C-alpha cells in the first residue's frame, strides 16, 4: 500500500491527465519492491559480509576480497549513449569504473595488518583458465617488480618476479576431500569433517 500510494502520489504530483496502462504500474511496482537494501548489521561485531560500496573506506585489520576475476570486477555500467556528460568529461564527473578502481585503492590502503585476495582461476565445469582482473594483475606485477625472495638474491628480474608471483599464488585443490590440503606445511585445512575422507582409511 505504501509503494502503490507513493507511485500514485509521484504521478499526481506532475498532474498526469492521460490514461496509464496496467503493465506499466506492474513493472514499476516490481522495480520498487526490489529496490530496498539492508545495512543494519554492517558493524555489529560479527565478521562483515558486504559488497564494495563507493565513498566508504573504513580501516580494518584483515581485509578480504572475493570475486576479483575478470568480468565480475570492476563492475561496468555502460552509458546511455545520448548523455552529454560522457561526451565532454569534466573534473567532477563520476563513473562506475573509476569508482571501482578507487574502491580497490581504498581497500588496499585501508588494510592495516592482512590483505586476502581470492579469485576464480580455474573453471569448475571444463577446467578452463579464468584470468583475474586488471587491478589484481597490476598489483601482482608491482609486487613482482618491487620485491624479491632471499633464496634467489641475484638471479634475474623476470624470473625473480615470476618466482615471487608463484610463491604468493596458492593454487588450492578442486575438491575439499583432496589430501594435498591436509599435507602439513605452510597451509593446512581446519575442516576435520573431511579428514577421514582424505585419509582413505574407511570401509567400502
Amino acid at each position: 500500500e505504501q509503494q502503490w500510494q507513493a507511485i500514485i502520489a509521484e504521478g499526481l504530483g506532475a498532474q498526469y491527465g492521460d490514461a496509464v496502462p496496467l503493465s506499466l504500474l506492474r513493472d514499476e511496482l516490481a522495480q520498487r519492491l526490489d529496490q530496498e537494501r539492508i545495512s543494519q548489521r554492517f558493524l555489529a561485531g560479527p565478521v562483515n559480509i558486504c559488497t564494495l560500496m563507493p565513498m566508504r573506506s573504513i580501516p580494518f585489520k584483515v581485509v578480504c576480497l572475493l570475486g576479483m576475476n575478470d568480468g565480475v570486477y570492476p563492475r561496468q555500467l555502460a552509458p546511455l549513449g545520448f548523455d552529454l556528460m560522457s561526451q565532454k568529461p569534466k573534473r567532477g564527473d563520476r563513473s562506475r569504473r573509476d569508482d571501482d578502481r578507487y574502491l580497490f585503492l581504498e581497500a588496499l590502503i585501508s588494510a592495516q595488518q592482512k590483505l586476502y585476495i581470492s579469485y576464480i582461476g580455474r573453471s569448475i565445469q571444463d577446467n578452463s583458465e579464468r584470468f583475474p582482473s586488471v587491478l589484481v594483475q597490476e598489483l601482482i606485477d608491482y609486487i613482482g617488480q618491487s620485491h624479491y625472495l632471499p633464496g634467489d638474491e641475484a638471479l634475474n628480474c623476470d624470473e625473480s618476479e615470476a618466482r615471487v608471483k608463484a610463491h604468493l599464488t596458492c593454487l588450492h585443490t578442486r575438491m575439499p576431500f583432496d589430501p594435498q590440503n591436509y599435507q602439513p606445511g605452510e597451509r593446512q585445512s581446519y575442516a576435520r569433517e573431511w579428514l577421514p575422507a582424505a585419509s582413505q582409511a574407511g570401509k567400502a
Binding site: D70, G71, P74, Q76, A78, P79, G81, F82, R97, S123, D126, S128, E129, R130, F131, S133, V134, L135, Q137, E138, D141, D158
Partner: protein
C-alpha cells in the same frame, strides 16, 4: 592466395585471413591488436593510432573471448616491458621493436592500454549486438 605476415598486413578495406588448423590464430589476433594500438606498418599502416575502446574483436565463445582478452593483456604487458627495456627474447617482438622509431610515447601508449584493459571492446556476437541495441536505442527501437 598469399602468405600472411602480421607486420606487413594492409589494414585497409576488407581482408580475409584463412588460419589453418594448429596455426597461431590467437597469436596473430594479438599481433594485429598491437599493430592497431601502436599504428605500425608504414605505408600499409592505419591512418591514425586507435585506443582500446575503438578496437572491436568478435569471437563467438565467451571463454574464447576471455582467453583472448587475457592473452592480449599479456602481450601488451610483454611489449611494454620490451619497449621500456629496448630488447626482447621473441623475434616477432624484435621486429615490432625495430618497426617503431620512438620508444617513450609507445611505452606510454602501452601503459594507457594496460590501464584501459578493463574497458576493452572484446565482446561476443550477441553481446556486441545487445550493446549496440542498448547504446543507440533511438535509431534501432530497443527498450
Amino acid at each position: 592466395a598469399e602468405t600472411l605476415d602480421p607486420l606487413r598486413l594492409p589494414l585497409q578495406g576488407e581482408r580475409l585471413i584463412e588460419a589453418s588448423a594448429g596455426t597461431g590464430k590467437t597469436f596473430t589476433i594479438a599481433a594485429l591488436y598491437l599493430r592497431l594500438l601502436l599504428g605500425l606498418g608504414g605505408s600499409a599502416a592505419f591512418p591514425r593510432p586507435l585506443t582500446v575502446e575503438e578496437l572491436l574483436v568478435v569471437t563467438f565463445t565467451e571463454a574464447a573471448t576471455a582467453e583472448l582478452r587475457g592473452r592480449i593483456r599479456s602481450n601488451i604487458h610483454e611489449l611494454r616491458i620490451a619497449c621500456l627495456r629496448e630488447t626482447t627474447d621473441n623475434p616477432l617482438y624484435e621486429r615490432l621493436l625495430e618497426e617503431i622509431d620512438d620508444k617513450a610515447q609507445a611505452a606510454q601508449w602501452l601503459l594507457l592500454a594496460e590501464r584501459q584493459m578493463d574497458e576493452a571492446a572484446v565482446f561476443t556476437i550477441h553481446g556486441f549486438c545487445q550493446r549496440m541495441l542498448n547504446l543507440n536505442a533511438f535509431e534501432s527501437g530497443m527498450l
